[PDB]
Amino acid sequence: MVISINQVRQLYVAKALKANTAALTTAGDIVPKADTAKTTLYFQSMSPAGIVASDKINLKHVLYAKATPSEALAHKLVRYSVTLDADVSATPVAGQNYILRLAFRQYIGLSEEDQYFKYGEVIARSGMTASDFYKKMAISLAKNLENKTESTPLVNIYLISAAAASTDVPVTSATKESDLTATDYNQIIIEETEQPWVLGMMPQAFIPFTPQFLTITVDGEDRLWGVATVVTPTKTVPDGHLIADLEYFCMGARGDIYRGMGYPNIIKTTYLVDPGAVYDVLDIHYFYTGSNESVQKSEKTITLVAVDDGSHTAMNALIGAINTASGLTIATL
Amino acid sequence: MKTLRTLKISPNAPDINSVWLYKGTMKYFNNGEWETIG
Numbered sequence: 336m337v338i339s340i341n342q343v344r345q346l347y348v349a350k351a352l353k354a355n356t357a358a359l360t361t362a363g364d365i366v367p368k369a370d371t372a373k374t375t376l377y378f379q380s381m382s383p384a385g386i387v388a389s390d391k392i393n394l395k396h397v398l399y400a401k402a403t404p405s406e407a408l409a410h411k412l413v414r415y416s417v418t419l420d421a422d423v424s425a426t427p428v429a430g431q432n433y434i435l436r437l438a439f440r441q442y443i444g445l446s447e448e449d450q451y452f453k454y455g456e457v458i459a460r461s462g463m464t465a466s467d468f469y470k471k472m473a474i475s476l477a478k479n480l481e482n483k484t485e486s487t488p489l490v491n492i493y494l495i496s497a498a499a500a501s502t503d504v505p506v507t508s509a510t511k512e513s514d515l516t517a518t519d520y521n522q523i524i525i526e527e528t529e530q531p532w533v534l535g536m537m538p539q540a541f542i543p544f545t546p547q548f549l550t551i552t553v554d555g556e557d558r559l560w561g562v563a564t565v566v567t568p569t570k571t572v573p574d575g576h577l578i579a580d581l582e583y584f585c586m587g588a589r590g591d592i593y594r595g596m597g598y599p600n601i602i603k604t605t606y607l608v609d610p611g612a613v614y615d616v617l618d619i620h621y622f623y624t625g626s627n628e629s630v631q632k633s634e635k636t637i638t639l640v641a642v643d644d645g646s647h648t649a650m651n652a653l654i655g656a657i658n659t660a661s662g663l664t665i666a667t668l
Numbered sequence: 669m670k671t672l673r674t675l676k677i678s679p680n681a682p683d684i685n686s687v688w689l690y691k692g693t694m695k696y697f698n699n700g701e702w703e704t705i706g
Contacts, residue, residue, distance in 0.1 A: 554677065555678045
């Protein structure tokens with residue numbers, strides 16, 4: 336990814352927290368270093384190549400220092416619950432094409448003027464219950480969206496048997512009617528998908544979508560056959576792929592900007608972010624001011640990352656150290 | 669003499685120059701009313 340900088344941003348990974356400069360042996364170790372006077376602050380980090388230290392923070396020129404949790408940075412996957420509106424009819428209406436249109440705004444491009452429409456069709460028959468209809472519709476949706484041919488993942492279709500309103504019975508183009516032996520299906524959930532990601536070339540994006548229904552003649556009048564309502568998401572996309580591209584960008588500030596450019600004549604940067612983990616973050620904003628005419632500020636950002644075990648143990652001890660060292664009182668998330 | 673030549677399926681009554689079909693009942697404008705049929 337590329338981000339907007341307030342004149343600079345540095346990133347440092349905190350894999351292990353040590354208590355001395357001598358204990359820095361492994362490439363992810365880190366120490367918050369400050370003096371008893373509480374006048375400056377810096378971090379001693381262990382790099383693939385030797386120890387390094389961050390720019391020194393004047394503890395009187397700190398603008399804000401807040402630790403975000405990992406939950407805050409996980410993109411929630413918006414999901415709808417699609418049904419048929421009991422005002423038109425609580426059951427399918429035979430001979431009518433129950434079409435369903437799914438619009439996609441940020442398709443391959445990145446604008447809202449780059450749209451993409453995929454469809455799902457079901458023609459109803461007499462004796463067709465609602466469960467049978469939802470089954471057939473989810474199946475026709477998968478075959479058109481979750482196929483082995485579409486260049487990109489678009490949606491995750493599911494089914495919910497009212498006997499178990501929690502479990503989201505999944506569906507894919509391989510799934511067949513017989514694999515769905517329930518009779519109390521009551522909705523077609525449609526959830527956005529994690530798009531593919533490659534470090535430093537494909538930012539973590541999503542394709543948002545709205546389900547648009549179509550008309551059916553029920554008693555002589557063209558009427559919409561369903562109602563799409565958003566429900567509280569239940570699947571979140573972690574920040575591993577996000578911190579990783581952050582590093583990729585913020586490590587070209589300390590180091591090389593010619594990443595892989597002239598392939599054999601390059602500086603290969605070694606990165607410590609695992610894109611399969613879950614990091615908390617600790618961003619600290621500060622500035623430097625000069626002497627007696629260079630009073631203009633130079634705001635400079637520094638952020639730290641640390642894996643999350645679920646209880647934020649790594650970052651909590653991290654800042655507890657920074658607070659014992661710098662007098663600050665950052666809050667232990 | 670009042671000859672109707674249209675039937676309309678709807679949940680709201682149509683013009684009085686037509687018959688009104690709605691889910692098991694038909695109605696035609698007779699005596700200033702929509703007179704059902706048995």
